[PDB]
A paper describes a structure:
By contrast, methanogenic archaea employ four copies of CODH (α2ε2 heterotetramers) and eight copies of ACS (β monomers) that interact stably with eight copies of CFeSP (γδ heterodimers) to form a massive 2.2 MDa complex called the acetyl-CoA decarbonylase/synthase (ACDS) complex. ACDS plays a central role in that process, wherein the A-cluster of ACS cleaves acetyl-CoA into CO and a methyl moiety, the C-cluster of CODH oxidizes CO to CO2, and the corrinoid of CFeSP receives the methyl moiety, which is reduced to methane in downstream methanogenic metabolism.
In both cases, helix αA shifts toward helix αB to close the gas channel and block CO release. Additionally, helix αA residue Arg500(Met)/Arg142(Moor) has repositioned so that it no longer hydrogen bonds to the A-cluster coordinating Gly279(Met)/Gly596(Moor). This type of protein motion in CODH is quite interesting, as conformational motion is not precedented in CODHs.
Residue numbers in the entry:
A (entry chain C), D (entry chain D): 4 to 170
B (entry chain A), C (entry chain B): 40 to 798
The structure:
C-alpha cells in the first residue's frame, strides 16, 4: 500500500511517510489517547463497515466530521459530531479538554476524507501542533505524519481488512 | 451632524475593534505552502513555524498571503467602481442626484466608513480617492520585511475588507442611479437563465466579464437598428445580471439572456453556439482565444485590464476590422472606443453567423468510439481533477455502454480542462462529458429574478423588530462564486430548506443563477415558489457581486433605522450591534476568487459570520472561537458596564463546511444571537434542533447552553426537553408550573444591552 | 507649451513603446515554481508550460508574479511619497516653491510622465492621486481570470516601473525642498559609516527604516536640549542617508551616524550596542522584538505600516510609557504622534542606558568552546544557508583552533539566522561568526559622501556632449540592495575599476554604504580618492532609494537640455533617445527587494540596461536580445525613415551576472551605443577589450561587429586589430594609409539619427 | 552518489533523478551534440583538472560561463565564453546556430555551478525547452533531468574520477 506515492501539487519538502499495513496496525495499537476522525466519505457501505470495526477494536473515540454522524447513530461506538476546521483548530490548543473532558489526543486516524479538505486542515495541525496523524484513506495525504499510498477501491478495502485483521 | 470616532479610518483607527474581534474569534492559519518566495533572499522553509531570512514565521506568511488576497479583491472592486463612475460622470454628468429608491440612507456603507452623505454623482469622487489612497498604503505593506506580526496583517485585512464594501457600494450606486436599474423593486422581472435558452439558429453575442458600460452601447445599437428579434445577446458571470437589470425600471421583461456562471464558459465556447465573444474585465478564462481560433469565434476585448495580447485597433475603422477578422488575418481585437465597439460587435455577429456553420468540438458517436475505448483508466486525470471525480471509472463504465456516469459528472465538473493535459492518450474528457450530458444541456433552463438593488427603508423598518428580537429566524445571505464541491445543487437545497422555515434568504452573484436553474415537481423555481420581498420565507436577488454591499447595508440599516443609532463614522458601535443582536449569516459555498475573500472579510468586520465551501480552506485563514473557554464569552452591559455572560454564538466568524447538510446545521445554529426574545429564541432553537436531527440524526449536544427560560424551549417539545434537562444535567425544575428554578447559567433579562465596548 | 502623445499614460497608451522594446529584447521567464497558489481552484501544476484551471500557462503565471513584485515596489515608493508629502504640507505649508537647486527642470520624471511642471508643493498632490489611481487599476489585474497573455503583464509591469520612478521623484522633491537637504552640492560632507563608529559608552538610538519624518523630531529634541554630544543616534538602511542629509545645506559635518545596511541589522541588535530601537518602515527585520526582549532593548514603532503587534500608547503620556518600558511591562510601543515620539525616544535612551550594562548575545571565550566542539559537521546549515557557505567546514576548522574561516565568512554572511533553525544541536552560528570577526567589527569603519540629490543642468550641459558622442565612456549607476553573493566588496571593486577608466559612477542606496566601507593602501576611500562631480572619474552619491529617480532624471535631462527635445508627456521619444544614444548602464548587485525590481523595470522602460547579481534570477523575468537574429537590429533613420542597421548593443535590458568580473565585462560592453563618434567608439571598445582580456584572458569574439571604421579601433592596438580583421575575417584593408575599404557591415555615418519609431 | 537527495526548498513535484557514476558516463557517451557548461566554481584546482579531462575525452565543446574562461585559455579544449542567463535563453530557441554554428545541443553537462543560480537558469530550460541536463556537481540540482546527489568534496572528487575512468 506504499507503491504509489504520486502527487500533483506539493506543499514543501517534508512529506508523509508511506506506511505499510503492519506499521499502521502497530501505530494504532501503540497510541495512548487516539481519535478516529471520519469524514462524510465513510458513509460508503464498504467503508462504514470497517470504520466501525476499527473503532470497536481498540475502543477509539470517533469524531464524525461533517454529515457522517448518521452512520454512527445506532452503532456501539462513542461518536461525536465536530467541524473539521474547528477540530483542527482545537487540536493545536493543549488545554482543550477534548470530546469527553480528558485533554487532547496524541494521534488522529483519518478515514474517508476529501483530499483537498483534509490536506488543508492538516496543514494547520502538522505545523502548529504536536499531534501525530495516521491517514488510512485510499489517497496519499502529503500533510500527514504517516499515510497510505494511492490505492484502488478494491486495494483500499483489502488494506483495511488487513488492518482490522492485525488489530 | 453627530459624527463618529472613526471617519475615513486607517489601519490604526480600526485596530481596537479588530483586536476586540480577534480576542474572541482567534485566527486559524492553514498555510497552503511551507515556503515564502517573495524576495530573492528566499525561498525560505517555514515548516514547523520556523522563521525565514527576514524573521517572518509561518503564521506571518500565511496572514500576509490572506491579506494580499483581500487587498486584491478590494482593488478589483474599487477599480471597477472608479472606472464605472468616471464613465458615468463623463457621459451623463457630474450633477445628477443619486437615485436608489425611497431610502433616507442611500449609502449605508459610505456613510458608516467615510462619514459622508452623498447626494450627487460628484460626491462619490472624494470617497473613491480615499479608497485608492488607502489601497496604496495597504499594498505598500506586502513588501518584504515591512510588517512583522500576523495580528496586524489580520487587522489590515479587515480594513481592506471594509474598504471593499465601500468600493462595491460606490460602483453599485453609480450604475443604478444612471443606467436605469430597478430601484428597490420587490417585483423585478423573471429572466430566463441557461445555455439551452439560446437559439442556435440566430447570431449570438456572448458577453463575458463584469463591466456593463461597454455592452450598453451594443444594446443601444441593437435597439436603435431593431436587431433584438433577429439577434441574441447572452451574458456570462455578473455582467449578465448587469445587462438584465439594464433599463428595467419599467419592469418589462428583457431580451438579453443569461448563459451561466464561470463554470460554463469553456462549455459554451466549445459548444460552438457563440458567434462573437466580447470580454469585459473580470473572471474571464485565459484560454478563450485559443479555443475561438479553432472554432472560428472572434474575440473583442474592451478594457485595459484585459487585452489578451490581441492587436489594438481602436483608431481603425469598423469595416476594416470586420474584413480582417472575416479573412482570418487576426483572431480578435481590443476596442476601447465604446461607440465603435457597440457598432462593431453586432455587425461582426451578423457577418460571422453564416460563415461558421455547425462548428463544434463535440464528437457525436463514431469519433467518441475510440475516444472512450482508448483509455485504460490509468488514474492521472483523477489526480489532476480539482474535485477528484472518478473520471477513469466513469470512462471505463462508458466503455461498456452506460454513459450515465459522465452525465452525472457533468454537474459535478467545473469545466477547468485540467484532466486533458495530464493524459498520455490526449483525450478531450470535457467534450466527452459534454456530449454524455447533451440531453441535460438541451434541458438546462431556469428562471432567476432580476436584481432588486437596495432594500428600501420601509421593509427594513417593518422587519427590524423581527430580526433583532429573533421573531424572524434570521437572514441567510447566499453569495459568492461557483466553485462548488459537489455541483450547483447544494445552494439550491440549502435555499429551499431555509425558505421552508421562514428565513429571509438573500442571494447575489453566481449563486442566484445556480439557485434559479433547478425546478420542483411542478416545474416552478424557487423564485416563483416564493416572493421577492424582505420578509420571512422570501428569496430576494440583489444583483451582481457589486450588490453584495447591500446585504451589509441592510445589516447596518437595521441598527440605523430601527435601533436609532447614528451611522456617521461609527463602524465599531454599529458592528458591535450587528454582532450582538442582528441574526445574519453569509454562505459562500463556491467561493474561489479574491473578491469573495474580501467580501467575507468585510462581512466579518461588520459582525456577520460566514460559512464557506470546503474549497475555501485554501484561503489560509479562518476565524474560530474557543467554545470551551468561558473567559471569551463575556460582554459589558451598556447600562452599567457590568460583565454579562453570552451564549457561545456565533462560534465562528469564518468557517468551512464539508457537505451542504453540515452547512445547513451551521447556518441554523449561528443565527442565534445574544439578547434574543424568548420567542425569537424559541423559534431559532426549534429550527436548529430540527435541522440537526434531520441531517445528523442526533440532538445537538450544546443545546442546553442556549436555554435561559422555559419559553426559550420549543413549544412542541417543551416537555421532553425539560425532562432531558432534568435528568441529564441535574437542573432543578418546578414541575407544577413547568418553571425553571435552577440550572441556567445566564438568567433571562427582560431588557439588556450586551456590548463588547466599555466606552 | 508643446505637449506630447502620452500624458498621464495608462496600460494602453504605453503599449506601443513596450511592444517595440519587447520585439528586440525578448522576455525570459525563470519560474520559481511550477504551481499557482492564487485562487481556490488550485494549486495548479503548470510544469511543462501546461495550463491551470483558468487557462493560464507557466509564462503567464511567471509574468504575473513579476508584475506583482513590480507593483508592490511601486506601491512602497508611492505610499512613502504620499505620506511624506502630506506631512510636509501639513507642517510647512502647501504654497512653498520647490527648491532642488539651479535646475531648469526640477522634475524630469514628473514632467515626462504626467506632463506637468510643478512650481509649489501643492502641485504634487494631483500627481500622487494619478499614481495611486493607476496603482489601484494595476493591482486590479492580479486577480484570477483578469488577464491571460504574458506580454500584457509585461507591459503593465513596465507601466508600474515608470509609476514607481514618478513616485520616487515626488518623495525626493518633497523631502529635499523642505527638510533642508543638500541642493545639488557636488562637495557634500563626508560622514562616518560603520558599526565601529558608535561609542558604546554613550546612550545609543538606532533608527531602522526608510522614513525620515519621524526621526526629525528626535533630532530637533536632541538639538534643542543640547544632547548631541552626550547621545549617539545611528541610522540603518536608507533612513541613515535621509538623517545624514538633514539640514546639510550648510555643508557642516553631521552628528548622526550610519551603522550599515540591512545585512547589519541583526548583528547590531545582537551586539547589544543599541539602547533604544526606533523603527519606521520598509526594510525592517521582522524579529527585532524577540531579540530586544532577550537583550532588554526597547522598540518604538512610529508608523501604521509597521506596528509589530506592540501596544498602541499614542494618547498616553510620555512618562507613563517610560515607566512601563523600564519595569518590563511592555517590550515596546507604537507612537504615531511625532512630537511625543521625538520627546520619548531620547528620554528613553537616557533612562535605559544605565539599566542595560554590557548585555550582549555574543559568547565571550567559554561558551564558544562547547559551541564549536559540539557540532559534527552534519551539513544542514549549509543546506539552509542562502549563500551556501561552507559553515560545517568553517566550524570544523575552528575546532582545531583556526578561527579565520568564520572571520572570512562574516563578510560573506548576510545575517539572516537561517542556519540556527535547522540545526539539531542549537548552535548560534551567527554569534560564533560575529565573535570570530570581532576584530574586524571593531575595525569596521569607512567614509561615505552625503547624498547630493539632483544633478544640476550646468554639469549636464557640460557632460551631455561627452555622453552622447561617447567621449565619456558612460554612466555606471550602482544602485540596489545588499544581498550580495560574495560579500560587500564586489561593488567596491567594480566601482574602483570603472573609476580608474574615467567612467561616471553614480551610487545610491545601500551600495554607497558598502562602497565607502573599504580603503586602499593609503587609508582613503573611493569618496576621497575621487571627486563627487558629474564628469569622468567622479563617484557621486545621490542619496537613498527614493533618489534612484535622479539617475533616470539625468538620463532624460541629457535629451532635454542637450539634445533640445521636449519632455512634456513624451515618454516614447525620450526613451528611444536614451536607448540609442546615451551610454548608461545600471548595476544592482545585491537586489532582493520588490523596490529594486520596480526601479530596474522603470529603468528598462526608459532605455537603460541593468545587470543584477546571481540572486536576482529569482525575480522570474529577464530581458535578453537574440544577438544572432539580424532582423531584430534594424532602426529607422529619422531623416528619411529608411532602415539603418545597428550593432547588437545593448544585448539585454535586464540580465544577471555570476561574478563581479563578468559584471565588469558586461558593463563595459553594454555602454556601447549606436551613433557613436569615432573617438567615443574607440574609447569604449578600448576599455571593453582591456577589461575582457584582464578578467577573462581572451579577446572578445564579437569585437569585430562593433567596428565601422579604422578610427573606431583603439589607437594603441590599431595595427594588431587590423591584422586580426585582415586574416580572420577576410576584410579588405588598404594598408598604404591604414584604411579599411571592405568588410564592415555598417558604413560609418558622419551624422545619422537612429530611432525605433517610424512616426 | 545518490544516497543524499535532501532539499531545503522544492520547486514543485517533478524533481531530478539521482544517477550513479556509470549512468552519468553512459549518458555522456550516448549524447549526440553535448555541451559542457562550466561555472566559475570549476576554477578550483581539484575540479579544473577533471573538467579538462572530461572535455578531452569525448571532445565536448565548453561553455565557460562567468569568469571561468581563464582556466581554459592554454588548454587543448574548445571553450567559449557565454552568459548563463543568455545561454539558458538561447537553448530554448531551436533556431540558434550555437557556439560554432551547427545548431543547438541536445544535452548539457553542468559542473561547478552555484546552486541558486543554476537552478533558476535551468527552471527556464527544463520547462520551455527540450534539452536534457546532466548535473555532475556535488550539489543536488532539482531542476535538472539527471543530477548527482549531495556529496562531500572528497566524495565529489572520487565520483568525478570514477566518471572519467569510465569515459
Ligand atoms: S507560496 Fe506558492 S509560489 Fe511560493 S513557494 Fe509556495 S507554491 Fe511556490
Ligand atoms: S520575505 Fe522573508 S521569508 Fe519571504 S523569501 Fe524574503 S526573507 Fe524569506
Ligand atoms: S489520464 Fe487519460 S489514460 Fe489516464 S485514466 Fe485519465 S483519461 Fe484514462
Ligand atoms: S475539466 Fe472537469 S473533469 Fe476535468 S479536471 Fe477540471 S473539474 Fe475535473
Ligand atoms: S489563478 Fe488559475 S492557475 Fe492559479 S490557482 Fe486559480 S485556476 Fe489555477
Ligand atoms: S546544522 Fe548544526 S550540527 Fe549540522 S553541520 Fe550545521 S552547525 Fe553542525
Ligand atoms: S545567518 Fe549567515 S551563515 Fe547563517 S544561513 Fe544566513 S547567511 Fe548563512
Amino acid at each position: 500500500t506504499t507503491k504509489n506515492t504520486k502527487l500533483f501539487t506539493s506543499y514543501g519538502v517534508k512529506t508523509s511517510k508511506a506506511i505499510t499495513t503492519e506499521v499502521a496496525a502497530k501505530l494504532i495499537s501503540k497510541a495512548k489517547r487516539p481519535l478516529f476522525v471520519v469524514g462524510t466519505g465513510v458513509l460508503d457501505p464498504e467503508l462504514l463497515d470497517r470504520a466501525v470495526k476499527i473503532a470497536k477494536a481498540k475502543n477509539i473515540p470517533i469524531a464524525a466530521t461533517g454529515s457522517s454522524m448518521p452512520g454512527f447513530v445506532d452503532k456501539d461506538v462513542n461518536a461525536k459530531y465536530i467541524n473539521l476546521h474547528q477540530l483542527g483548530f482545537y487540536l493545536t490548543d493543549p488545554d482543550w479538554p477534548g470530546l469527553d473532558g480528558n485533554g487532547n489526543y496524541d494521534t488522529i486516524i483519518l478515514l474517508g476524507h476529501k483530499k483537498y479538505y483534509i490536506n488543508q486542515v492538516l496543514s494547520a495541525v502538522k505545523n502548529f501542533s504536536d499531534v501525530k496523524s495516521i491517514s488510512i484513506d485510499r489517497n496519499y495525504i502529503q500533510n500527514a505524519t504517516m499515510s497510505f499510498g494511492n490505492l484502488s477501491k478494491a486495494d483500499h478495502i483489502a488494506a483495511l481488512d488487513e488492518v482490522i485483521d492485525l488489530l | 451632524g453627530p459624527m463618529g470616532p472613526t471617519p475615513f479610518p486607517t489601519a490604526a483607527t480600526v485596530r481596537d475593534w479588530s483586536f476586540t474581534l480577534f480576542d474572541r474569534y482567534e485566527p486559524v492559519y492553514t498555510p497552503m505552502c511551507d515556503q515564502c518566495c517573495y524576495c530573492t533572499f528566499g525561498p525560505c522553509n517555514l515548516e514547523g513555524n520556523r522563521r525565514g531570512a527576514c524573521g517572518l514565521d509561518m503564521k506571518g506568511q500565511a496572514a500576509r498571503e490572506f491579506f494580499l488576497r483581500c487587498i486584491t479583491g478590494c482593488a478589483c472592486h474599487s477599480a471597477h467602481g472608479r472606472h464605472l463612475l468616471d464613465h458615468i460622470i463623463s457621459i451623463f454628468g457630474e450633477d445628477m442626484p443619486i437615485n436608489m429608491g425611497a431610502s433616507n440612507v442611500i449609502a449605508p456603507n459610505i456613510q458608516l466608513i467615510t462619514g459622508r452623505q452623498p447626494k450627487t454623482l460628484g460626491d462619490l469622487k472624494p470617497i473613491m480617492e480615499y479608497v485608492e489612497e488607502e489601497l496604496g498604503q495597504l499594498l505598500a505593506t506586502v513588501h518584504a520585511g515591512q510588517e512583522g506580526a500576523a495580528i496586524d496583517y489580520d487587522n489590515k485585512a479587515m480594513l481592506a475588507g471594509i474598504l471593499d464594501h465601500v468600493g462595491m457600494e460606490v460602483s453599485d450606486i453609480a450604475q443604478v442611479t444612471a443606467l436605469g436599474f430597478p430601484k428597490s423593486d420587490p417585483e423585478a422581472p423573471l429572466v430566463e437563465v441557461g445555455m439551452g435558452t439560446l437559439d442556435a439558429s440566430k447570431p449570438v453575442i456572448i458577453a463575458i466579464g463584469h463591466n456593463v458600460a461597454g455592452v450598453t452601447y451594443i444594446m443601444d445599437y441593437m435597439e436603435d437598428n431593431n436587431l433584438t428579434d433577429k439577434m441574441e445577446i447572452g451574458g456570462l458571470c455578473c455582467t449578465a445580471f448587469d445587462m438584465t437589470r439594464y433599463k428595467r425600471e419599467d419592469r418589462k421583461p428583457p431580451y438579453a439572456k443569461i448563459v451561466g456562471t464561470i463554470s460554463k464558459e469553456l462549455k459554451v465556447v466549445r459548444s460552438g453556439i457563440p458567434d462573437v465573444i466580447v470580454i469585459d474585465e473580470q473572471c474571464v478564462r485565459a484560454d478563450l482565444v485559443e479555443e475561438g481560433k479553432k472554432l472560428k469565434i472572434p474575440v473583442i476585448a474592451s478594457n485595459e485590464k484585459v487585452m489578451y495580447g490581441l492587436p489594438d485597433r481602436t483608431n481603425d475603422d469598423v469595416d476594416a476590422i470586420i474584413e480582417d477578422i472575416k479573412t482570418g488575418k487576426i483572431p480578435g481585437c481590443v476596442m476601447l472606443d465604446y461607440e465603435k465597439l457597440g457598432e462593431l460587435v453586432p455587425r461582426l455577429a451578423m457577418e460571422m453567423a453564416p460563415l461558421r456553420e455547425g462548428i463544434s468540438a463535440i464528437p457525436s458517436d463514431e469519433e467518441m468510439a475510440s475516444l472512450v475505448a482508448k483509455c485504460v483508466a490509468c488514474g492521472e486525470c483523477a489526480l489532476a481533477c480539482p474535485e477528484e471525480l472518478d473520471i477513469p471509472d466513469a470512462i471505463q463504465a462508458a466503455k461498456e455502454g452506460d454513459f450515465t456516469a459522465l452525465d452525472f459528472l457533468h454537474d459535478l465538473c467545473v469545466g477547468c480542462r485540467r484532466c486533458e493535459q495530464v493524459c498520455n492518450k490526449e483525450i478531450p474528457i470535457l467534450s466527452v462529458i459534454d456530449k454524455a450530458a447533451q440531453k441535460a444541456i438541451a434541458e438546462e433552463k431556469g428562471l432567476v429574478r432580476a436584481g432588486r438593488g437596495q432594500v428600501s427603508d420601509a421593509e427594513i423598518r417593518a422587519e427590524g423588530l423581527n430580526l433583532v428580537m429573533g421573531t424572524t429566524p434570521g437572514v441567510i445571505a447566499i453569495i459568492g462564486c461557483a466553485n462548488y464541491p459537489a455541483g450547483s445543487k447544494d445552494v439550491y437545497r440549502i435555499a429551499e430548506e431555509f425558505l421552508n422555515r421562514n428565513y429571509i434568504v438573500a442571494v447575489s452573484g453566481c449563486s442566484a443563477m445556480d439557485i434559479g436553474m433547478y425546478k420542483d415537481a411542478d416545474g416552478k423555481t424557487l423564485y416563483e415558489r416564493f416572493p421577492g420581498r424582505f420578509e420571512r420565507g422570501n428569496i430576494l436577488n440583489t444583483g451582481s457581486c457589486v450588490s453584495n454591499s447591500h446585504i451589509s447595508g441592510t445589516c447596518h440599516k437595521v441598527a440605523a433605522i430601527f435601533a436609532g443609532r447614528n451611522l456617521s463614522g461609527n463602524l465599531a458601535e454599529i458592528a458591535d450591534y450587528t454582532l450582538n443582536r442582528v441574526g445574519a449569516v453569509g454562505l459562500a459555498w463556491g467561493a474561489y476568487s479574491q473578491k469573495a475573500a474580501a467580501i467575507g472579510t468585510g462581512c466579518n468586520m461588520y459582525g456577520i459570520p460566514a460559512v464557506l465551501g470546503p474549497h475555501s480552506g485554501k484561503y489560509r485563514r479562518a476565524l474560530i472561537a474557543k467554545t470551551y473557554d468561558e473567559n471569551k464569552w463575556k460582554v459589558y452591559d451598556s447600562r452599567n458596564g457590568s460583565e454579562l455572560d453570552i451564549p457561545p454564538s456565533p462560534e465562528f466568524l469564518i468557517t468551512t463546511a464539508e457537505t451542504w447538510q453540515e452547512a445547513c446545521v451551521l447556518l441554523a445554529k449561528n443565527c442565534i444571537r445574544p439578547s434574543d426574545n424568548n420567542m425569537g429564541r424559541s423559534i431559532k432553537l426549534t429550527h436548529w434542533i430540527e435541522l440537526s436531527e434531520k441531517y445528523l440524526g442526533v440532538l445537538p449536544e450544546d443545546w442546553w447552553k442556549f436555554v435561559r427560560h422555559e419559553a426559550d424551549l420549543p413549544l412542541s417539545r417543551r416537555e421532553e426537553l425539560l425532562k432531558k434537562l432534568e435528568t441529564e444535567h441535574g437542573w432543578e425544575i418546578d414541575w407544577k408550573k413547568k418553571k425553571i428554578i435552577s440550572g441556567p447559567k445566564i438568567k433571562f433579562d427582560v431588557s439588556s444591552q450586551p456590548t463588547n465596548l466599555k466606552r
